[PDB]
Design a protein around this ligand. Sequence first.
Ligand SMILES: O=C(O)[C@@](O)(COP(=O)(O)O)[C@H](O)[C@H](O)COP(=O)(O)O
Ligand SMILES: O=C(O)[C@@](O)(COP(=O)(O)O)[C@H](O)[C@H](O)COP(=O)(O)O
Ligand SMILES: O=C(O)[C@@](O)(COP(=O)(O)O)[C@H](O)[C@H](O)COP(=O)(O)O
Ligand SMILES: [Mg+2]
Ligand SMILES: [Mg+2]
Ligand SMILES: [Mg+2]
Ligand SMILES: [Mg+2]
Lengths: 140, 466, 466, 230, 355
Amino acid sequence: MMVWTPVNNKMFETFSYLPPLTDEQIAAQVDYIVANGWIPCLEFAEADKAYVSNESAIRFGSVSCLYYDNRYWTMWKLPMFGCRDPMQVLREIVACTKAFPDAYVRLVAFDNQKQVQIMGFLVQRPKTARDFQPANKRSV
Amino acid sequence: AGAGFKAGVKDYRLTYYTPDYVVRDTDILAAFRMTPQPGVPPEECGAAVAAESSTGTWTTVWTDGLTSLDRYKGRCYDIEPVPGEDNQYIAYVAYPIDLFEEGSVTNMFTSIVGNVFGFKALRALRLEDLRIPPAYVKTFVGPPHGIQVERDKLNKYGRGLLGCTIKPKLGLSAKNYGRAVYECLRGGLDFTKDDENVNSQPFMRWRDRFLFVAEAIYKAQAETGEVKGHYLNATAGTCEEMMKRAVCAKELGVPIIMHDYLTGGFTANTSLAIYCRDNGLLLHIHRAMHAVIDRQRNHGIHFRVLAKALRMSGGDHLHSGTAVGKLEGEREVTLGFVDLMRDDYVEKDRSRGIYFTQDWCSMPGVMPVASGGIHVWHMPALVEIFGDDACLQFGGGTLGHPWGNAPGAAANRVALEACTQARNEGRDLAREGGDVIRSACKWSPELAAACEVWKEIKFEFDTIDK
Amino acid sequence: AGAGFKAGVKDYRLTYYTPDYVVRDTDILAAFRMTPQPGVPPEECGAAVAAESSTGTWTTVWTDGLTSLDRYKGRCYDIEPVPGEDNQYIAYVAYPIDLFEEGSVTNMFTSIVGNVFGFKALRALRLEDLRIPPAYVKTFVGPPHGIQVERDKLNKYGRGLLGCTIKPKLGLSAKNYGRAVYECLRGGLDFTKDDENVNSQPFMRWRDRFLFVAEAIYKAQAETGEVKGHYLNATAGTCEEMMKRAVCAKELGVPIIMHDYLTGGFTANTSLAIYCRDNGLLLHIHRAMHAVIDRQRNHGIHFRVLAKALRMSGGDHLHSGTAVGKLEGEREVTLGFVDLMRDDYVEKDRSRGIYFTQDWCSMPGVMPVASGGIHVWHMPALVEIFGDDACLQFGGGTLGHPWGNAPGAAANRVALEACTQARNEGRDLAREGGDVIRSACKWSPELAAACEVWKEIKFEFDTIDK
Amino acid sequence: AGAGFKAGVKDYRLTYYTPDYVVRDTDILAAFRMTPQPGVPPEECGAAVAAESSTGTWTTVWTDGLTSLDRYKGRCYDIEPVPGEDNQYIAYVAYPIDLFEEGSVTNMFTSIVGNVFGFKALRALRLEDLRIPPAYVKTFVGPPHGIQVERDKLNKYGRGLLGCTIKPKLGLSAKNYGRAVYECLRGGLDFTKDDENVNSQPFMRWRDRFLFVAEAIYKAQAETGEVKGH
Amino acid sequence: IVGNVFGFKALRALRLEDLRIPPAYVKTFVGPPHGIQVERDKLNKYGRGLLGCTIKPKLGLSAKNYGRAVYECLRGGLDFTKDDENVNSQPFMRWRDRFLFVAEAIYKAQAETGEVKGHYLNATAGTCEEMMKRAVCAKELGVPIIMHDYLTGGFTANTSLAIYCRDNGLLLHIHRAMHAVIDRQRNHGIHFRVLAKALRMSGGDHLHSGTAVGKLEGEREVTLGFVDLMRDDYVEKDRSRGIYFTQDWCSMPGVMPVASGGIHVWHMPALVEIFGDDACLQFGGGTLGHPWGNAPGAAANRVALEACTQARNEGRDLAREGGDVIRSACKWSPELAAACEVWKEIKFEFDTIDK
Ligand SMILES: O=C(O)[C@@](O)(COP(=O)(O)O)[C@H](O)[C@H](O)COP(=O)(O)O
Ligand SMILES: O=C(O)[C@@](O)(COP(=O)(O)O)[C@H](O)[C@H](O)COP(=O)(O)O
Ligand SMILES: O=C(O)[C@@](O)(COP(=O)(O)O)[C@H](O)[C@H](O)COP(=O)(O)O
Ligand SMILES: [Mg+2]
Ligand SMILES: [Mg+2]
Ligand SMILES: [Mg+2]
Ligand SMILES: [Mg+2]
């Protein structure tokens, strides 16, 4: 029996339970976006704004149901409407991570027919992050 | 003298069988699978069904003349023979929109399925489908939130949601319930849930459960940094008790409650859906009792009708079946009603049991929930059947893991994410599914332990609801 | 003695088949007519039903060890073969009283019939009967009034009550509705009623109906000097709307309202029954949709269970079927559940489909209502089957009379009183019924007209629910 | 590269004038009598009205790409010249049912007549008619009773109803108001009425009026044997 | 006053131009929930016009995307964003979902910028009961401001809402949807100055006033006239600005004029010159139409406003030097330069109907 650690084991939604995505695996996800005609977009946040929190609820009556702070991140430029080139997305990842080397960065994609985000995963975490485990240390 | 009152009995077909009727775009249409008694013509049987579900009774009444029967009568307008059956027919009935109370699923069922199933003149009757026109759809509040808004509120995208029913079904204390919930949620599941029959009982009263579950949700959320929920059961003996439970959930700030819509009933469900809309609670719907009604091919109401009814009455999630699990549900039929649950416009497709084109006129879609006897080996098939817009629930498949709930939850989460990644990379889960899970097993010890335990476990039986 | 947790799947029968169990007087007992898939032993099938309706799931869970499975598990304790069937069995299951929420029919159904009907491992399942122990019965409010109190409030004794459903079912205006009601009531009927599907619709909104019907009730009562009523339908899309309708009835001072308990639901019904108790309204229960569930021999829930459930949830009247009318209901089966509805103590009697002795521990009786395709010639048979403690309803049989509603009502009232008198005088209605009616015909012109119109009208078909 | 975001102003007609559109039976339709400024084509004016009463503004916005403009846009689908007029046109506009709040006349007006009447590019605008589809009609409670039920409640059939507004419009006391009501009703009128501007005022407070009027109604009813109202 | 007389056969046309509301009648009204001074004090905003922005497209965005757009606008330097007048509750976006996501956006932008932020959440509804439910939710979220379409909702509903706002400390923004149906033509209807007086009495903290220079009609002199009627305590008769009667407001709080509709950065000097500091200037298309997105769009408008304000304070004449002020700011701010390039040639110059 192995024990799933509760200490410094924060996750990051889709694909965070798999091995970290290689550059080839990221490229494959980007190809999938383009193949389906979805709209790629990058979003980023400083460490203090990365995970869901409750601070604004101090201002509320009994209306906190499904309210969380830090769901919104900050948009990098604009969604890439009309993008049919995977290399353009990859170049924007490089540009965003270069401008904000200490930020969390996630790649998302939108479907304008359902009008909902249809994919999303983390592509950068700050080097100073120490609230997560390598795959092989998630259980003890 | 014109047409006056003549007392006495005459054939239903004289008034209610209208084969040349052109249906109106506001009519509610019903497809009944009808088995007449010997010596009863299909036309008379169809006419009888139309009559006794609308305006008519067994003998002529004088009061008909004060109104316009033409305006109000249900009309049997087509009868199809059933291939492979000597005494089965599909009778199509059109009902004027004027017959129905706006916003009331209760009223719709009371007319269409109220009395006709008990008629001596038929041996069996099954309601296969209903065409709910946009003019009637628009009278309903519908789902409190629906698929898009739910994902947006939870901040969860790009994969199916994962859930788990706490087990044993009954017998755990409130504290142990919360303990199990915490351990499941912290391992990678998005949701846990009360079993359908967990309401308030001597072994665990509801408010005690709600509070401990609240503690568990918030603990798991802080630990993982992902939004977590537990479907707290609001199902109760009275509307007043049901509402008290919903209010407590609101006051705890938790995201989601559940209701057994068939055993609680449509009247209570619609009230709860309205409360959820007004207070921002997600509403998970359990279909307890549906198989009493929808299992047999010859008699009852097909689940696709019960699913349309729920979408109108209101729910954010609805159990859809798994196809591969311990409970029955044929693949093609399931694909059909899943579209009816999720999509805006569904074209007629008899190969998937869709008898009528259904236009939902922008009513939000309902998240299908696949649950019951599923485990990690089913993951590829489940992702292939449902895609991302579904919740997959593992009760036994989590609390039955040899290392406990958190490793159990992690195994399911790893399996789901591995299959999702593989699909995204262009792999065919229908053919490569086994390979995907085997590769993930070699990588994840939690997953490897689950795969070993349930490797040989399958549920393969002859299908009744064909 | 504790044992280690062992992950994996084992047979249900290892835990849930307990043939030596001696049932406790507080246990809820269920009799299931079970049809297993080929290759599934009856013991395993019975154990699966017991397991999945109580505490168990498809694989072993560790959490069982935190509680006492012995204390909480449902137990298949007996299996009977079904004479005349090769693959049908009666499985008896016992459920500890601790499993159930006090006062909640919703909860009881959710456990017992929630999921098990959909199991792949069975081909069909029917719940035939339930033994509700006194200890659980006592947790329910039950009927707002019951047979004795109803008779005392209405001041009506010594004969069956007579009623009538207004027709056409739908399409009449509120004013014409009230007009029909007044004419029916003034002719000798005790009650009239909204059809089950008359709620609030474009052609007639509910409050308009309620006011005009109030005028009609009070007019007929002043005219005849007998207490009159009309079952005003409270069935609605939401609990809030249902309650608004009940409140209006209260404020008009009228005696009785109705509710469609299966289409509205148990949660709504229980709330309405409680409201009716607290405000002194009689509550008539319509069983719309029951035949979807209760028609077929091999699958569903027998009406006797639905009737017990209603007696617990609450209703002063419940539709019972006629046996002789347009809708199915076998005589022996009907006499069985009529006793279950009315009596305090009903002994086991398999010849009438009573699987368990039922002790109602002073819970009030529910008045059976015979309705559907009946007319004057049926009167002797109805008085013989039901006796005085019943309501007999003639919709078509009143509004279909050649001279109109008041003569139609008078004809039915004369027929009833003639049969009642004849019985009291020692005549055998089973043999002399025809003679009683013919004698009354020669005396009453109103009755003579009714007898002529419907003389040849019978409903005789092969019975499905045998 | 597909259609993407291009900042800047373009003609409304490029998006909002769709002369080949086949209207849906769920669409709300509007007929506008439109008088364009000199130098503004009718098509551009009609497009402007459709745009600014639905989804569009004066310059291109990037957020359009997150949704489906095709699904939501108002569409000018026909333009008729007005006979006898040199600069008047009937522009027909179709609005998806999705644009409107169910049961809210307020919302319907806010969209259709909210801002477009003030556009510099037009000299005048008149909304002539609206096609309210059954799917939208059914979302409204509508009249509390309607003609048939009203006749039924009042027990009045076979002739027009007769009413009377109390005069002078303002200035009468509650007691004198009731006195005038009684005398009108008893002579054969079915109804009397408060003048539109009689609400509650220094010369006559509303509750005082209501009570005296009640006395008058019941007096006239008892005297004539016919149902009366005010 | 306007109930029946406009339909008299004996007249061909009738227009109500002005009303003198005497102090004795003014004093019977609750009036604006807060008014200009109190609003500035609550928001802690002084020394410049307020800046706002209507989210676009008008209809069709989901609640989540609405909040996303709001956050990006507010974080770039706008004080407020707003629901479009016709955004109430619809299949594509139900109101309570919007309110919650917008609340998240407001609080995020506020924490990021360190300035108080708001979004006018639309309470306009089909019934008074629905309207009040929406106002209550705004109260329970602790957000500063709601809006109402006073002519399409109606005066009875507006007055109720204003009273609720006073009692619960919510600011009330008033949209004048439908006013041009009534107030456009010279020969017939009711002049907007009367509709503005009526709103000041019924109650509102902000009211749309027109722009003069934007896509919707509004002559300069007439506008200056009713802006004084909206803001000031005492306004003397002045026929050159359409003021027919001296109006004494007897200390009833003033209403903040809101200039909105087809305006962009090049209009900024003219707007600051017309309105001064006691106004809100709203840029819908002028923010969400910026080539770099909402935050840079907001920043461009904010820089333009602050540059004009500084220039005025330093003694520069915005009527003459306005172009120079903007051009200098363009050379300094890349965000502003991008906006200036896109809308350089865009003007709305047509013959005025309401002369
Ligand atoms: O009670 C149960 O059996 C479950 O909790 C599953 O438990 P396991 O995960 O342990 O199998 C679900 O309620 C059923 O799947 C419902 O069936 P359906 O979804 O078909 O309505
Ligand atoms: O809708 C009808 O058909 C009835 O009004 C009877 O009308 P008639 O009197 O004109 O036949 C009753 O509701 C049914 O008898 C209900 O069946 P049951 O009592 O078996 O539940
Ligand atoms: O719907 C619109 O057009 C606006 O949101 C402006 O959008 P833009 O900023 O994109 O132009 C405003 O509601 C109008 O200005 C109202 O007019 P007024 O202020 O004259 O009442
Ligand atoms: Mg369950
Ligand atoms: Mg009936
Ligand atoms: Mg008048
Ligand atoms: Mg606007």
